[PDB]
Amino acid sequence: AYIAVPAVVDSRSSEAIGLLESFGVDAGSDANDVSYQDHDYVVDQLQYMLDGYEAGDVIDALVYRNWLHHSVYCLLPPKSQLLEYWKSNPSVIPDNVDRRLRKRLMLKKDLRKDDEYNQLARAFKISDVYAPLISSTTSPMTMIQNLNQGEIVYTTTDRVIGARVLLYAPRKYYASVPHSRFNVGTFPSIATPKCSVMSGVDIESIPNEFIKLFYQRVKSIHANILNDISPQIVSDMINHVDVYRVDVVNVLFEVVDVADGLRSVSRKLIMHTVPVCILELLGIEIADYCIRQEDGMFTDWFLLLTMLSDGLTDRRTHCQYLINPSSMPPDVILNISITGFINRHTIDVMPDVYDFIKPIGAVLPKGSFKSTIMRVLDSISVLGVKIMPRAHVVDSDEVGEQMEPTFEHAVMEIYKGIAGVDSLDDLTKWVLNSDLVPHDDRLGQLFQAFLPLAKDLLAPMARQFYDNSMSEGRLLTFAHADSELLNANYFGHLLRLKIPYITEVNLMIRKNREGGELFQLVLSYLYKMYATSAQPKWFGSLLRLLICPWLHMEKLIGEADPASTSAEIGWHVPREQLMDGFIPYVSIRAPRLVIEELMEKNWGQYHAQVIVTDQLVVGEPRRVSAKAVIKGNHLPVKLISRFACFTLTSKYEMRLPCGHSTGRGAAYNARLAFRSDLA
RNA sequence: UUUAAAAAUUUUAAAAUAAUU
RNA sequence: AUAUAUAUAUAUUAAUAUAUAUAUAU
RNA sequence: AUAUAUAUAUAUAAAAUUAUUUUAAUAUAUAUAUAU
Ligand SMILES: [Mg+2]
């Protein structure tokens, strides 16, 4: 038998990870008959072969492979070096080769200029000697056919796909498996009657993007002849822990209005890739739930779910939904009822944009729940780590509040430029009519005045504020539009974000804000008009990274020794220059065997000017604030491998638990240095 | 009966000088 | 005695900054 | 923890349009002619 899965299957590691409990199969037992297959090199060959050929030809060829039929290529050097190898060590010559050619190669002459051997080599071709010879222009369908029928195939090129490539001659003449009745691996085929494909995982959620292309192309042409089997059917047929790889499903639920004992389904939705660990933690299963529980504010485990995922779309009309944040009708979600779970798979929580250790700027619209998400995020501290303290995050209003006329006060006086308004309430009435969605022309006349305030005041103030903030440690900073972080030249990762709710209603729900609620809302419209359209991309994309890796590591280092499983890596200054103390800058947490490996890495080729001060901090541990400015290069994440759970924010500060006296401050030209205990 | 029209192609890849965006 | 071209032959392949180790002194 | 001398290694400076000038021995030896 043979089964194909949407994932890169390997015979070494895929047994360790399993992949079958991954996709949701109950293979767990003394099964030892589901033998995997090596498709790493096959994916690499597919990528290399799409470079020259066409995707349709390559995929429609590779689909007709009999993966349970062992075979192999072996490439020949070109004709010249081939003949050189025929000559030297001549007792390997196939008998097809011409009698004259063999009789002339068996001679010990220099072969400098043999008048007849030159002709005999000119009229010699490789294709006649070795029978199955693929081509330099094979037009690959015969490649897969010849791999299907036979044991060895002879190529004169490297662009081949289907099996491994073996060398024919020694390296000089070139330039620079048992079955188990339940074989599995990627790349479905239709070679036999027993090839099956495991359904249950959507096509748009496949993460590899080459397996994804292969599946799309094969499933749009061979839909009616493929054998689909779900994870339950596969289960019935059968019957250095990596962090940042989490299992995700999505929840199927509908809205219910249980008034006076009469159930009434109202709407059906899909939560779109909440991670499985959070559903396990919160104890979510098939039952009814109330998602407010008091005073019309969400119960906040529901808020955590909605903020840890992508967004929910209606199942009737396949479009996004954006559930209502208020508690006023027409639409109010007060009671839901989860009904099932569909496609499960792993994803890489580490975004590709994040490779170096640097600050993070998360742009959100105005009316989002930034305050409540901060209140909910500052509490988590898994292994005594405090993954996101409240002091490491920069509020969105801070850069505008630090001005003599603050920014919002500066824009409140904008009604003087209009032809005639005479008051802020008349401005809010002249802009949007008797609901939101203001008049676009009037909003444009207002934006032409709002813009110079944002380009001439806010940008110059922010260009200094973000520098001052970057000096004193990594911080997670928010904003109301990417243009704020782009005009003011912001350093760090620029993550746009978005929330699954209607943010414009929060601007009416919240009361005690400067100016009327209508003014806050018009201000949000102006920021949204100053936005430079680009994909906001689902706020949960960040919170999933923030939370998920720690929960997994808590299973591995839940009970080990804190001294043996810990570390900290900061800027070092020698015991002199007191006219040793290091600023932390990072706090690693990982098993002992990886701390041993991190203990020996360089960590010293990274420099920065640390400027210690003499100011005291109200916090308990007696410590003095400091600063630091990296010079040359930034710490890449590869050093802190995928097996440790580090922190993303940190303040710069030094503790002084010896001879308490703060003298004069200074700059010292620190050097990075690993700092753990004995372990 | 002897003479003659002859091809005006490119975008010419790099290295130095000068002018410009 | 010098050089140029003619035929052949032969060999042949073409500023600043930083890091590391040695030594001497503190 | 540092200073000086030494040795080794590394990083840094672009694209386009226009016009002009230069890019088939490397060397020697024998036989031929010529010039100084
Ligand atoms: Mg210019």
Per DSSP, the residues of A39-78 read -HHHHHHHHHHTTTS-HHHHHHHHTT--TTS--EEEEPPP
Residue A191 one-letter amino acid:
A
Q: How many A from CA of A414 to the centre of ligand 1?
A: 37
Q: Is the peptide bond before A330 cis (omega within 30 degrees of 0)?
A: yes
Distance A456 CA to ligand 1 centre (A): 25
Which residue is associated with the tokens 């009657």?
Answer: A193
> What's the A531 CA to ligand 1 centre distance in angstroms?
29
Both tokens of residue A144? 């897969």
Rg (CA), chain A: 33
Q: Residue A397 burial by CB count (10 A; 0-12/13-18/19+): exposed, middle or buried?
A: middle
Give CA–CA dist A520/A522, Å, rounded. Answer: 6
User: CA dist A370 to A376, A396, A667, Å?
Assistant: 10, 9, 37
Span from the CA of A455 to the centroid of ligand 1 (angstroms): 24
Nearest-5° Cα angle at A18, A17 to A20 = 135
Q: Is the CB of A80 under 7 A from strand C?
A: no
User: At a CB cut-off of 8 Å and minimum separation 6, what does A202 contact?
Assistant: A343
Beta bridge partners of A267: A255
Q: For strand C, is any atom closer than 7 Å to the CB of A673?
A: no
How many Å apart are CA A426 and CA A75, to the nearest integer?
Answer: 81
Q: Which two tokens stand for residue A544?
A: 């999933």
Q: Give the CA count within 13 Å in the CB-facing half-sphere of A250.
A: 17
Nucleotide nearest to A605 (CA to C1'): C19
Gap from A81 CA to C13 C1', in Å?
A: 22
Technique employed here was cryo-EM
Do you know the residue count of chain A? 679
Token readout for A58 is 């390559």
CA of A605 to C1' of C21 (A): 17
DSSP line for A368-419: S-HHHHHHHHTT--TTS--SS-GGGEE-TTHHHHSSSS-HHHHHHGGGGTSS
User: How would you class A425 by CB atoms within 10 Å of its CB: exposed for 0-12, middle for 13-18, buried for 19 or more?
Assistant: middle
Q: Helices A55-62 and A40-49 meet at what angle, rounded to 10? A: 150
> What's the CA–C1' distance between A53 and B13, in Å?
29
Q: Phi and psi for A331 in degrees, rounded to 5? A: -115, 120
Smallest CA–C1' separation from A575, nucleotide = D1
D3 C1' to A640 CA distance, Å: 36
| Inter-helix orientation angle A55-62/A211-219, to 10° | 80
- Would you report the helix, strand and coil content of chain A in percent, each value rounded to 5? 30, 15, 50
Does A605 contact strand C, using a CB cutoff of 7 Å? yes
What is the C-alpha to C-alpha distance for residues A365 and A328, in angstroms, rounded to an integer? Answer: 22
Q: Which nucleotide is nearest to A607 (CA to C1')?
A: C18
CA A80 / C1′ C8 distance in Å: 32
A147 Cα: distance to centroid of ligand 1 (angstroms) = 61
On the CB side of A558, how many CA atoms lie within 13 Å of its CA?
5
> Which uninterrupted H or E stretch holds A362?
strand A360-363
Q: Are A382 and A550 a contacting pair, CB within 8 Å?
A: yes
Distance A607 CA to C17 C1' (A): 13
| A473 Cα–ligand 1 center, Å | 39
Cα A578 to middle of ligand 1, angstroms: 53
A532 C-alpha to ligand 1 centroid (Å): 26
As beta bridge partners, residue A480 has none
How close is the Cα of A464 to the center of ligand 1, in Å? 29
Is the CB of residue A574 inside 7 Å of nucleic acid strand C? no
Give the pair of three-digit tokens for residue A299.
Answer: 């119960």
CA dihedral for A76, A79, A80, A83, sign (positive or negative): positive
Q: How many CB atoms lie within 10 A of CB A189?
A: 21
In single-letter form, the type of residue at position A336 comes to I
3-state secondary structure of A422: coil
Phi, psi of A421 (to 5 degrees): -135, -50
> Does A230 contact strand C, using a CB cutoff of 7 Å?
no
Residue A604 beta carbon within 7 A of nucleic strand C:
yes
- How far in angstroms lies nucleotide C26's C1' from the CA of residue A535? 62
Alpha-carbon distance of A53 to A48, in angstroms, equals: 9
Residue A212 tokens, joined: 């994804």
Of A478, A456, A475, A457, the C-alpha closest to A467 is A475
Q: Which nucleotides of C are covered by protein (CB under 7 A)?
A: 18-20
Cα–Cα distance, A53 to A134 (Å, whole number): 15
Yes or no: say if A407 and A520 are a contact pair by the CB < 8 Å rule: no
